[PDB]
Design an enzyme around this catalytic site. Sequence first.
Site, PDB file in Angstrom:
ATOM      1  N   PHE A 125      -0.351  10.314  11.583  1.00 29.97           N
ATOM      2  CA  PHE A 125      -0.032   9.274  10.598  1.00 29.97           C
ATOM      3  C   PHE A 125      -0.090   9.821   9.172  1.00 29.97           C
ATOM      4  CE2 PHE A 125       0.112   6.920  14.176  1.00 29.97           C
ATOM      5  CZ  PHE A 125      -0.649   5.766  14.329  1.00 29.97           C
ATOM      6  N   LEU A 127       0.402  12.816   7.976  1.00 34.63           N
ATOM      7  CA  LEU A 127       1.566  13.647   7.686  1.00 34.63           C
ATOM      8  C   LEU A 127       2.803  12.786   7.420  1.00 34.63           C
ATOM      9  CD1 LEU A 127       1.231  16.628  10.301  1.00 34.63           C
ATOM     10  CD2 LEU A 127       1.382  16.900   7.823  1.00 34.63           C
ATOM     11  N   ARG A 328      -9.324   7.695  -0.806  1.00 34.68           N
ATOM     12  CA  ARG A 328     -10.243   6.574  -0.983  1.00 34.68           C
ATOM     13  C   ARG A 328     -11.578   6.928  -0.354  1.00 34.68           C
ATOM     14  NH1 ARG A 328      -8.999   0.269   0.290  1.00 34.68           N
ATOM     15  NH2 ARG A 328      -8.874   1.006   2.445  1.00 34.68           N
ATOM     16  N   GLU A 419     -11.936  -6.037  -6.028  1.00 34.64           N
ATOM     17  CA  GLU A 419     -12.032  -6.717  -4.741  1.00 34.64           C
ATOM     18  C   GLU A 419     -13.411  -7.325  -4.508  1.00 34.64           C
ATOM     19  OE1 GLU A 419     -12.661  -2.401  -2.513  1.00 34.64           O
ATOM     20  OE2 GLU A 419     -11.296  -3.846  -1.611  1.00 34.64           O
ATOM     21  N   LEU A 446      -8.094  -8.927   0.199  1.00 31.38           N
ATOM     22  CA  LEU A 446      -8.777  -9.228   1.456  1.00 31.38           C
ATOM     23  C   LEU A 446     -10.287  -9.116   1.301  1.00 31.38           C
ATOM     24  CD1 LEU A 446      -6.224  -7.375   3.643  1.00 31.38           C
ATOM     25  CD2 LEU A 446      -6.606  -9.837   3.640  1.00 31.38           C
ATOM     26  N   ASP A 447     -10.768  -7.974   0.808  1.00 31.99           N
ATOM     27  CA  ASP A 447     -12.193  -7.858   0.509  1.00 31.99           C
ATOM     28  C   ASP A 447     -12.615  -8.949  -0.457  1.00 31.99           C
ATOM     29  OD1 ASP A 447     -12.448  -4.346   0.953  1.00 31.99           O
ATOM     30  OD2 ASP A 447     -13.853  -5.833   1.775  1.00 31.99           O
ATOM     31  N   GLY A 603     -10.207   2.604  13.370  1.00 36.65           N
ATOM     32  CA  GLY A 603     -10.475   1.682  12.285  1.00 36.65           C
ATOM     33  C   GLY A 603      -9.316   0.798  11.842  1.00 36.65           C
ATOM     34  N   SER A 605      -5.996  -1.396  13.649  1.00 42.08           N
ATOM     35  CA  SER A 605      -5.342  -1.717  14.909  1.00 42.08           C
ATOM     36  C   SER A 605      -4.406  -2.893  14.717  1.00 42.08           C
ATOM     37  CB  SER A 605      -6.346  -2.057  16.023  1.00 42.08           C
ATOM     38  OG  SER A 605      -7.294  -1.020  16.208  1.00 42.08           O
ATOM     39  N   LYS A 606      -3.292  -2.842  15.432  1.00 41.11           N
ATOM     40  CA  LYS A 606      -2.383  -3.965  15.478  1.00 41.11           C
ATOM     41  C   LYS A 606      -2.942  -4.979  16.467  1.00 41.11           C
ATOM     42  CE  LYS A 606       1.825  -2.879  16.362  1.00 41.11           C
ATOM     43  NZ  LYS A 606       1.666  -2.079  15.102  1.00 41.11           N
ATOM     44  N   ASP A 618      -7.998  -4.399   9.511  1.00 40.92           N
ATOM     45  CA  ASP A 618      -8.941  -3.357   9.128  1.00 40.92           C
ATOM     46  C   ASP A 618     -10.269  -4.047   8.824  1.00 40.92           C
ATOM     47  OD1 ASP A 618      -8.500  -4.516   6.661  1.00 40.92           O
ATOM     48  OD2 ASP A 618      -8.726  -2.583   5.617  1.00 40.92           O
TER      49      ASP A 618
END
Length: 710
Positions: A125, A127, A328, A419, A446-447, A603, A605-606, A618
């Site tokens: 992912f 790359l 991050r 956030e 979101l946070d 960490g 996932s769909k 997440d």
Amino acid sequence: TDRVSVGNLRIARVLYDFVNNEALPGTDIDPDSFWAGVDKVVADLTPQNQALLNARDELQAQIDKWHRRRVIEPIDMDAYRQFLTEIGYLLPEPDDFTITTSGVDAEITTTAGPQLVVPVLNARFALNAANARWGSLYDALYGTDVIPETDGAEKGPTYNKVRGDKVIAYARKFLDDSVPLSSGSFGDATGFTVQDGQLVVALPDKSTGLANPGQFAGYTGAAESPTSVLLINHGLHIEILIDPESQVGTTDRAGVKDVILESAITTIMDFEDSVAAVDAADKVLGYRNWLGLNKGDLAARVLNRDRNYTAPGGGQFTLPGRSLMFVRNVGHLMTNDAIVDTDGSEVFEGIMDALFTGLIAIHGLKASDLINSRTGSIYIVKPKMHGPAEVAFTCELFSRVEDVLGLPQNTMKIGIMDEERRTTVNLKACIKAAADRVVFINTGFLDRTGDEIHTSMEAGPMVRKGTMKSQPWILAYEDHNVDAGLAAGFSGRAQVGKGMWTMTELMADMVETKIAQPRAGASTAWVPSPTAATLHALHYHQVDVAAVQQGLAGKRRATIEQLLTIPLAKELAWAPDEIREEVDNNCQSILGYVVRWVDQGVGASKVPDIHDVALMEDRATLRISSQLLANWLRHGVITSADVRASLERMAPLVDRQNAVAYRPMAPNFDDSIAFLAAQELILSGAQQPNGYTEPILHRRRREFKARAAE
Ligand SMILES: COc1ccc2cc(C(=O)/C=C(\O)C(=O)O)ccc2c1
Ligand SMILES: [Mg+2]
Ligand SMILES: [Mg+2]
């Protein structure tokens, strides 16, 4: 103990070796001086780090007690604001100022466009993300529902020409609206040529140039029958690929094969909420990927070279083939036993991340056996900070790390996530605390929604999760973020960024509604895939962000009262079927995420929700769901039996969507560590600091790893 002693620290051998053998060579940093600095920095800064965390807790308890000692409802904003000021939560707003950050690349100071976030523990992912600076528009339109799968136009196992024509026509309209012809339409073009350094498009009955010839940026191939034509609009490049013997080109009126957009201008390699890393072995996998990204030699499939072009006049030039990379770090909360002291206490993970991702980042400032930041900066996103003192501490940490690394002061730039509530209401002071380091502010909504729920936990029941995205507090929060950035001179100097689109399959919805973000003055916003980056890029060709930011100069669109408007649910408000749906919806979301977190260490996932829509979940969405149920359980909306029944209801369904090397949760629920983690995040949600999910997740994932080893 598989540990290495350096002063007061006991370093996991796998991490010590990785740094000595892979990360330090090529930096000209003496290994002994590095580790001595690791030890020195950790000892100097840990107390202040801890003091800050205790202060969060002090403030949250005084607020808890404030709501408890009052039955008066709804509120006395005057009183609540005065209390927040008294207890030092709400601080004086400093005088106006302009940021002084320098040494920043153009992708940040100048270009407006998508920003992609990717888990650094998944090398493949990462790359694709770094390569997502350029992306095929035809692939993104053919592959997603932006072209509806209506009768006759659906995707099958081979090319549907009806569908492809829809894609071609969609792209012609885009070209018309972005790079207009003098007269006529790209839809009727038959070919392209360059003459006297000008782009000439052949129409059926005449030829034409560009309405703005300056939007012609270059070409490849012979000027009198090019292989591609390069254009620019709003600082972003568009490349028209010409090949009539290709599959798509054979059918095209001008032999056009594809339309390539400059898509993900920058990418955030994530060590935080999209990854699961609970020990030294996890962090080393992350660090090692971040290392190969900066050295240019990560392979799983490799990194792209720069793109070569011919200028209009005839010279040669080059464009970057890779997205400019951020990293991050985790924030101030968690520790990690990758390093322990002599008492056996874990070291703060954020201090470690700054030392190690900063060291690794030096490789991206030098030639790869071809660079990240040409201007000499290291770009660290710092999440989950609460107020300007927490920002000042991050700045001091970077100063101490720069000193240990031999780096010029202010090499390590900071992207401030906005956030947490105590940052939002002191935002100007936070930017000021980082005035010489800040490269963006970003509304991590979101946070921010999780912190909203937790902070006012005791005030009453909150609105439903889906309601949160349109509450008054969040719209003021969004506008106040842009206002504070623009007022601090971010235009032309730093990014003003907004939130992630999480519905990976609802790409028509994304194209239709995410346009609001650049329309609100945001120079960047977050996408979760290279596909989404290419499609979001369309919004920056439609909206002139620089002009938008210009028109907002000096405006003040959010008051402190609005920011402080708690999202309390009104009387009644819900029927039984609606309360049940929200509980079921939250429990399946929590379960689907947690089961892959705890069992397989994934960490991000769909996870399909109760309406069968696929959401990229997440840690932040997990913070929202668990806090919301915690708040409902706390104010009598639902009972502990409802939670338990809903969890037990949805668990078999999640097990089905994963049936892989997967450990089912049902029917022996209390034997599944993942299931008990989900339960614990809800039942202990109100007691977790600021509602954070990492304590419980890290503990349960380590517990699971230990069982899997005996
Ligand atoms: C591969 O799929 C991904 C990868 C990274 C992601 C990152 C976030 C996020 O971090 C949001 C904020 O920080 C904030 O709203 O608090 C959300 C969804 C994600 C989905
Ligand atoms: Mg976040
Ligand atoms: Mg324009």
